[PDB]
Design a protein around this ligand. Sequence first.
Ligand SMILES: [Ca+2]
Ligand SMILES: [Cl-]
Ligand SMILES: [Cl-]
Ligand SMILES: [Cl-]
Ligand SMILES: [Cl-]
Ligand SMILES: [Fe+2]
Ligand SMILES: [Fe+2]
Ligand SMILES: [Fe+2]
Ligand SMILES: [Fe+2]
Lengths: 359, 359, 358, 358
Amino acid sequence: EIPKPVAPAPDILRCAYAELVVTDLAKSRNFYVDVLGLHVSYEDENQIYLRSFEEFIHHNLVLTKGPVAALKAMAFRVRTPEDVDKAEAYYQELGCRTERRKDGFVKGIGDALRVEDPLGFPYEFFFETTHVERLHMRYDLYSAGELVRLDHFNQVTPDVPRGRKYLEDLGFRVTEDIQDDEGTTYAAWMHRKGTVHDTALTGGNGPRLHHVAFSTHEKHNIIQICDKMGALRISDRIERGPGRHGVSNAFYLYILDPDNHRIEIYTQDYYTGDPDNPTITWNVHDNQRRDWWGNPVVPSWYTEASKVLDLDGNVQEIIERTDDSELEVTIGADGFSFTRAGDEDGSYHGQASKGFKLG
Amino acid sequence: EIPKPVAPAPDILRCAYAELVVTDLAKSRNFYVDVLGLHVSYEDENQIYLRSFEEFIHHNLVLTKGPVAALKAMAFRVRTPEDVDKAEAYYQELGCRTERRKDGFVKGIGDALRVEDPLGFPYEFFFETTHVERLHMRYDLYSAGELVRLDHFNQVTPDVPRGRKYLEDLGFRVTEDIQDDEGTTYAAWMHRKGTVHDTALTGGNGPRLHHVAFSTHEKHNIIQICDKMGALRISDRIERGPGRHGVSNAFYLYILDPDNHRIEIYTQDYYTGDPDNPTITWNVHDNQRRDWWGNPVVPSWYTEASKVLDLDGNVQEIIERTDDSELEVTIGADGFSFTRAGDEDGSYHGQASKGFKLG
Amino acid sequence: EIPKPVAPAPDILRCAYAELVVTDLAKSRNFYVDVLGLHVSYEDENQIYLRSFEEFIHHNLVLTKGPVAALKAMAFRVRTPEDVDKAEAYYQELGCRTERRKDGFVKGIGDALRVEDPLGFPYEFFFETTHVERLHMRYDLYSAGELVRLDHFNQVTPDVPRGRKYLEDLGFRVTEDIQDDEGTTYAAWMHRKGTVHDTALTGGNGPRLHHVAFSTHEKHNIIQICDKMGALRISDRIERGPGRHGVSNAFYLYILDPDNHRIEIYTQDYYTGDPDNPTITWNVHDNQRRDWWGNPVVPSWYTEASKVLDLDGNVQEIIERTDDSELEVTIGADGFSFTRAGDEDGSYHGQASKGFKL
Amino acid sequence: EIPKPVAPAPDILRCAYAELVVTDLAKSRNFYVDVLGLHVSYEDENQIYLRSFEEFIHHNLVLTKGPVAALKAMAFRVRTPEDVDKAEAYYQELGCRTERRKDGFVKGIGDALRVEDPLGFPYEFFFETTHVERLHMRYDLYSAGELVRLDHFNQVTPDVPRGRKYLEDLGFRVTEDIQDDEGTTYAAWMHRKGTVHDTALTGGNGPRLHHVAFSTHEKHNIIQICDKMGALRISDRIERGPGRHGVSNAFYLYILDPDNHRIEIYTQDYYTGDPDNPTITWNVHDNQRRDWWGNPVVPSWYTEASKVLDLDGNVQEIIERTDDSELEVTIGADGFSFTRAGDEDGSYHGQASKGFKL
Ligand SMILES: [Ca+2]
Ligand SMILES: [Cl-]
Ligand SMILES: [Cl-]
Ligand SMILES: [Cl-]
Ligand SMILES: [Cl-]
Ligand SMILES: [Fe+2]
Ligand SMILES: [Fe+2]
Ligand SMILES: [Fe+2]
Ligand SMILES: [Fe+2]
């Protein structure tokens, strides 16, 4: 198990940015700028820095040219400069590796601490950042598919309760989760900023990064992203969706960048900011839980996910889930799901919903 | 082939209504009134008459209680009273069985002709109908999924070329179709009223009724129908969608009624009224032709459809398709589909798109 | 009163395009392309040919450099080539000026007739047109405010019943109108293609062209336009709206180009194509008739509209309306409108809705 | 001026509910249930308790029958039970009248303090409340105009900076305001929850309540409410809008209940949760500041607003504003506003925009 430090948690505001390593910077640029319409804060031969429509800090996304596509850092902003010190001491007491830089690891951040956390993810903590033009009323730039906010991260890790417990101590609150009747946990959603989440744990072989998620204003904006990809004839890059989530109640779409990093597009979850906000527990065999319309979850969503780096730039060793697999118990050959609890009509045995089995 | 008669064709305006036979009248009323929100023009213990938000003729849909779920009539409105006489002389010349009633076959229709057409579908032609209150500004009744118009029918029939020719002679115009490079035609779409269609031919064992289609104002209205069926826990009655059509460019959803009559919901196709409107031919192997975003067509959409009756009320017997099957050549075990013509990336051999095989 | 010719009427499909004379072509290009997002079929130093997102004929709008901002032609397409010959006989039998060109008056149009019609308007009729790439599934090119079709014209003319009869003989069919209890017709809406209209008549001093109208797919598209014009600090070129109409039931917005031609953006009216489509008459004092939410109609909407040209390029003389004016009787000093018939609460005497005088 | 107490401020989460006095309970029920489709958590002969689609606390709105229409209380929720003790001490130090009831003032709320604050408003602070079914996925019950959360209050007071300063000591952070260059502050917006506001200060005579505001999901939802009020022929109870704000960037509408309590509908403002959020100041004479599209602000918006009650159920005594009026210096006869600063095109002197005066 992971222990609670005596030293006090840093105060975390929100998820703020991610640094992804990409192999071909021109090819990733066409996708994140031309196709999806993020806005360039700064760029050179080695890096592109990008922000959503309504953001005032330097970037929400850094693309870094490198040899192996992988997550380099997930960054959280914290409330005061002094909370960075607090991060340092707190992870020092957990016995984790930490690396601090008073001018930052990337353009347009200042005093920053990166760490290998006890599940093996590169986490960054900062306050200082260069403010840029907030574009939020720049409706002369607005695209039909506009991405307005960075909303959350999603991490793959093989023991969900162990990760859950370490993130409650750091101050995150659980909003929803997926279990069975016999006490296995399959995923958990957890928050700092009063949306459904800032990061989430998906049971699975890790450490790996499942996705990063940007927000739209309205549901038609997500539809337009699917339409555009059809017109550019890259509909093979739409992995899953669009649809409505059970868990989180948000409208969604999952797409894939040229290195197969997964991006979610996401809108219209609910408010969680009150400390007794009711938690929601779904049964794993509930076919309405991940997609409310009962559409099947494509196998790659469970199996594929992005590698993560240590502080030296080497890939983290993968540790295998031993608990039950969500893929296996729902859509595999000995799996099942239901539409109405306890009813064999609109139940599925050994296959996915709507007439499909696994290819 | 089917001859062109000497007698002039009736002048058809549009699709107007369908009579469907249903087994349980209470359960059907629940689906169509309580779930879908259509408006009752009249009802009694045997029959319900339903119209959509913007319609002013008596009804767009008659439900009639009977022993076997089946289509009983698909109704086209003609331009003048005299075009009912022309429909009778026309189909008599083809040697088709006909029945004329001065007083209608259902309430709210006047002088009316039903026929067993040469493909064995029960067509009705009428001019006279009872006007009712047009509800088009009754925003006090508008639901979040309001169905606003009837749009079209879609018919299953073994020989599409044989079928389209007949329909062309009668004055329908082809707008789009689906073919391969060996000269097989799998489907054709055709209109009178200035949209992409008023009826369609889908290649398959027929005569069978594939679906009936209503439109909405906007795409979010269709999302609401899905969301609602989620909340009432009948997501197993969503067959296919929602998504964006290739053919027709409409936003779409397919659902099933308690007797497995399929209903499509549909919005935002394009204008076809000019007589030199350019026809679009899609290739059957093109994985964006039915769903533009490449999501797989569910098997039940190709195999299942509703029975139809002759005019003595017996089920029309089935004739098999001998021409190539669209299911078989796209997602069966020696099937093939592509995303980009000439590219092995984003192509599919012996399976469906996004990682699924046939259940 | 205008006679019905013995000769047969041309079969008109729909409105197709307008040619408008503009004064600075650069400044008009910035409006119709950069702000509004219409698609160039062709341009040179003197003309820009624009089309909407779903059009397959050559153009929905020609901008032509000229000394006087005006309407040059309003064009309707007919169903066959022989309907152009049909049109020529019909307007000759009215004693109207006609000019025919076998290769057209503008690019992308073939055999074509222009008339000074009996109301002094420039009507073009044609079949032949050059086909271009139908951009309807080009979502790589989709604007958040995309204009998807041409919907209709609106014409200002002094005597509306006189006009209406003429268009009925031509085979247009009236869908909605505005009258009062004293015999006056104020406006009228009429179709060939099976939407609420292709053209319409607004009582006023004319001939003038009141506006051209374009469709969007959804209501949010029309909002984006207003939000964009905000962002560019040209909100002052939003005349009226956005809103929902009484007449037509459509969501709407009116904006002004750089020569003050008026453009409407429109969506989600209803099907009119059955021949017993029920006509709706509104009373002129009904304050939900033009904006259903009862927002006031800005005076400039009643008073301003574009000059039109005769067939030699001269501005048509303007003839004054003698029947009562829709402005004077609703929101001028001696006007009246109501929210509910017979109810003093929510009625306005001598002023507009929501607290405003003119 | 209003002193910073030594006692610690209570930790305020958000606006939570308002209790409004109404004169006819059955007509107000018809407005708030049948027209707007809020969800009943409890009612009887004297009170109705109402919540929005995504709420899980007992109510966002109480309607209480009484002789005069007014605001009985605007309630904020605080993080812990201990915070209600802090609020009591804090306001006792300020010299303000306090009443603590351990069993609450209304149903579904437990331990609560109401206060007459220094600006004359009835504020409640509470943590304990009864939980009820969270209806967020009950799409079986979802209407085309669904109100999904309660968003904010807006208050009228005659000296904004004095009020600003009071709320800043309480933990509220200013996000946007309106000033001129003569020093004068006309209005200001502040928050706890990390949207643009939880309450706001509008310069004018008070104490009065300007409005309570509810959210929608999307912009078409707000449109539907206008369209529905047209079909019910109560478009005269649409005061102002729909529109897009400058300040806050939100899509908006303002409507009037049967007692002339004003309700905003509101969607799609921005995240403010970061402690260094850039503060935005608008010039008062800028005609895109309250309506981005430049539509005129109706005078009733500036001059009308609800009464408020003291803790005895009596009406506060109103206090005149001596500072410049926002109405007078924008849309009355010595006023002006611009579209583009330094430009006389699209300027209005002595009248409102789009061709009106008052
Ligand atoms: Ca072949
Ligand atoms: Cl999911
Ligand atoms: Cl299809
Ligand atoms: Cl109007
Ligand atoms: Cl405002
Ligand atoms: Fe996610
Ligand atoms: Fe269809
Ligand atoms: Fe118009
Ligand atoms: Fe407000």
